[PDB]
Amino acid sequence: QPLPPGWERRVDDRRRVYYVDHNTRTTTWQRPTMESVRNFEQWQSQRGAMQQFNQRYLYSASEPLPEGWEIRYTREGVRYFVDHNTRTTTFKDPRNGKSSPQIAYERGFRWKLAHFRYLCQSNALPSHVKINVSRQTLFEDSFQQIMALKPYDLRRRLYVIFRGEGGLAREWFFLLSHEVLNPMYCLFEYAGKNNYCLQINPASTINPDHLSYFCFIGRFIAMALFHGKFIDTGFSLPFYKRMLSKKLTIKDLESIDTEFYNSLIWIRDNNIEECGLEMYFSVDMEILGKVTSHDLKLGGSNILVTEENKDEYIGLMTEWRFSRGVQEQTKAFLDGFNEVVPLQWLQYFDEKELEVMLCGMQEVDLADWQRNTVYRHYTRNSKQIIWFWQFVKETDNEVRMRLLQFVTGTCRLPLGGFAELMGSNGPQKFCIEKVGKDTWLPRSHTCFNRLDLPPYKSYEQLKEKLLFAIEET
């Protein structure tokens, strides 16, 4: 097998083959091709705008209790207790009935975030640990240093020393959170055009140490959470749902694999018998050239999909697509995370809260947003679009961010603003389309950054439906 210019084969002490590029000193376990070379070269996108990333930090300028309960305080200092399990509040301590106009129940992201910060603070160890990393070898050096430490050492103060040279911690987290995506390591890939929809790469097995690296990456993301630092890696919301052990759904599927979702949706909503569709309860996978067949259930490759059983086929295909080829990697990541921040500490956050905790949130440029929003079967003077922008103006940045996550599937905004907004198939501006009737709820297609907004009859109805849709799940 011939190799692109600059590259050479090498064999290590255990007779395992790897590859080295004598011009750029990169090494990889997967045989490079010109496709992978051009992929790597574009990925080398200064990996600068760290100062604009740092605005997230200034922006964040704001006996045990039974599970799911919180202590909160009213604006006048009055203690109350929130039961997330029943979505109610009381002034009566559930531990002992001691009582301090019942307070409206509310999700209260900021309260949950503050309790979590206290949880981390309560479990910090004293002193510091020092991480010595060469900036040009940042991934390999951070890996060696973190993995050499007992997980509890990761709960001390972090002193990062960039070889040959507080704010160094933020810079470490930002830079390394980009560095782990380096395709030469083979841990990740993208589902969409450009760098759209990150996911674990089933082919990471070509790296014999891939599970140690996924463990390290879990430890690293947990460390960002514990130390209150923000990362820029761009995990999907279904990935975070997996970290929360939440059920992954067909709607989740739309976010990460348009074609797969579209096929499943067509099978659900069409008579597959009247149109001759011939399908069975097994699926093929190809990793590193090798094809593998997987029965969805016992003997699945022999079971014809019919009108009678196709719902079961659909659920099994959804589950399979979410977990295919990445079970071990995902476990390694979860394990590494859990030994720094117990996953149980996340139990009452949703996936969008988790993403904002990891990524930090910015203030949204309402003018840039509105200047770069496009419409389908609406115009800027439709009553519902005027109501939309009135609702966006009338609310706070938390709701705006939650709406942003609803429509685009993420809280991360592009460096160039809403004109540079990206979808799975390339550039794709925020879009509001007229669908359905005023009795529907809004819906979103995050691959196209598109909000289906029913044509409501009054501002207040638009407000209620919109708030309900962005709060949901």
Numbering used by the authors: 381 to 427, 432 to 446, 496 to 533, 539 to 603, 609 to 916
Can you list sentences taken from the study reporting this PDB entry?
The Nedd4 family E3s have nine members in humans (WWP1/2, Nedd4/4 L, Smurf1/2, NEDL1/2, and Itch), which share a common N-terminal domain architecture comprised of a C2 domain and 2–4 WW domains that are responsible for subcellular localization and substrate recognition, respectively. Each HECT-type E3 contains a characteristic HECT domain at its C terminus, which catalyzes the transfer of ubiquitin from E2 to itself and then to the specific substrate. The HECT domain adopts a bilobal structure, in which the E2-binding N-lobe is connected by a flexible hinge loop to the catalytic C-lobe. To prevent excessive ubiquitination of targets and self-destruction by autoubiquitination, HECT-type E3s normally adopt an inactive state characterized by intra- or inter-molecular interaction.
To elucidate the molecular mechanism governing WWP1 autoinhibition, we determined the crystal structures of WWP1 in its fully inactive (2L34HECT) and partially active (L34HECT) states at resolutions of 2.3 Å and 2.5 Å, respectively. In the 2L34HECT crystal structure, WW2, WW4, HECT, and half of L (aa 413–427 and 432–446) are well-resolved, whereas the WW3 domain could not be modeled due to its poor electron density. The HECT domain in the closed form of WWP1 adopts a T-shape conformation, which is highly similar to that of the isolated WWP1 HECT domain structure. WW2, L, and WW4 are organized into a headset architecture, with the WW2 and WW4 domains acting as the “right ear” (denoted as “Re”) and the “left ear” (denoted as “Le”), respectively, when binding to bilateral sites of the N-lobe, whereas L functions as the “headband” of the headset (denoted as “H”) by forming a kinked α-helix that is tucked into the cleft between the N- and C-lobes of HECT. Detailed analysis of 2L34HECT suggested that the intramolecular packing is mainly driven by extensive hydrophobic and hydrogen bonding interactions. The hydrophobic Met627HECT interacts with a hydrophobic cluster formed by Trp387WW2 and Phe420L. Pro651HECT inserts into a small pocket formed by Trp409WW2 and Arg396WW2. These two core hydrophobic interactions physically anchor WW2 to HECT at the “Re” site. Hydrophobic Met434L, Phe437L, Tyr441L, and Tyr443L interact with a hydrophobic cleft formed by Phe617HECT, Phe673HECT, and Met804HECT at the “H” site, whereas, at the “Le” site, the main force driving the WW4-HECT interaction is hydrogen bonding between His517WW4 and Tyr543 in the N-terminal extension of HECT. Unexpectedly, the “IxY543”-motif in the N-terminal extension of HECT occupied the canonical “NPxY”-motif binding site in WW4.
